[PDB]
Amino acid sequence: TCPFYKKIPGTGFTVDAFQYGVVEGCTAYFLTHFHSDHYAGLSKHFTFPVYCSEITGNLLKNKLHVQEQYIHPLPLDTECIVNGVKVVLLDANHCPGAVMILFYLPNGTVILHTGDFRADPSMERSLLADQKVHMLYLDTTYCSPEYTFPSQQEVIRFAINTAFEAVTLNPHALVVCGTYSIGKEKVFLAIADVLGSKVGMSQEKYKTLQCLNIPEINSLITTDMCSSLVHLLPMMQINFKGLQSHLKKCGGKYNQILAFRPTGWTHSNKFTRIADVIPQTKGNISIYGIPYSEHSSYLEMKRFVQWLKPQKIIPTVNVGTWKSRSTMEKYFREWKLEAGY
């Protein structure tokens, strides 16, 4: 049974609600992005209309085999009528194809559903500038002041400078980057660009990347592992055992691995600056955990919400415990008292 925070009142619409069977009264199922917790339940046997971005619809057709007749891609930043209701899709600054959804209800209420997002001041000059929002369905993943991390640009500068120094010292070093979903592609693309290499990967991951409308992608990635000195592997394999085993497979081309695990936040964020980050090392293998987030920090979230001034907030993450729900409600009231709405 579908929870209340996935239903849009006064419509036949749901958001990210594919794992509940046939939802009573639902005429259109929206999908914000192609991450497994959000598409859980979709498959080639799905027979109701799915609304989404073009990139999400490429992934639904090629990776999950959803039939074409049920995929309804919408352009971004463009007013569209769906089943009698005006909607707009906005870039969520999350993974490729991820959107926020503005719903203009027939009674005059305006609802923003952020999906998953990383708030940015550039959103203050989108189509959100133009009118008031009554209800905000908010990605609260990091809604507590302990959740701090650097800008994505600082993180990428650290990664590129670390990889370029290692491989210039030792031209026989291999760079490996962990992945387990779409998102965070800038990590491995920026490192391969400074090294003058294509990125090598499995046929399954190549297929996924070919769905993402990245400019000049054919110049950047390959399935020919032997030709490349930046490899992608499953995130589960980014450990000393898994990396040893991969180095065996490269036919004595390499004698060192430098590996990256883009995580979200970890408690090593509470003490260490990005500049001061060091790897875990065993023999000729070194592993860096780098804090590349595709969700809002606490401060980015608070800025967005204090600018938007919604009348009501509905969290969509961390909703399963009374302690989490009470913590989030306290911060919402602080923000509102401080800003005066």
Ligand code: NI
């Ligand atoms: Ni996500």
